[PDB]
């Protein structure tokens, strides 16, 4: 927190919570393909839910 927090808030370090399956061991997911939680298809830059 000394070296890497920011007075305005360190937004640099990002993490993922939305994925189709659980991450497998010894693997990383840099992909940011728009994930969809809602019942209908979602597309483009964003979609509802």
């Amino acid at each position: 927190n000394k070296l890497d927090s920011k007075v305005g808030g360190n937004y640099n370090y990002l993490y993922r919570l939305f994925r189709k399956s659980n991450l497998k061991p010894f693997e990383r997911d840099i992909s940011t393909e728009i994930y969809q939680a809602g019942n209908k298809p979602c597309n483009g830059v964003a979609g509802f839910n």
């Binding site: 919570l17 939305f18 939680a37 019942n39 839910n49």
Partner: protein
């Protein structure tokens, strides 16, 4: 679907128990646009 919500300082508290919750019908009956959850994801809410 209340007739009217409370004031911000006399904020209205109500406990929900002895019942089954579905958040799918909670949104699908009535369009809305603000949503953010901590300690759980909006999908996984359905089963814990």
């Amino acid at each position: 679907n209340a007739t009217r919500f409370a004031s911000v300082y006399a904020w209205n508290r109500k406990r929900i128990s002895n019942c089954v919750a579905d958040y799918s019908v909670l949104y699908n009956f009535a369009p809305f646009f603000a949503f953010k959850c901590y300690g759980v994801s909006p999908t996984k809410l359905n089963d814990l």
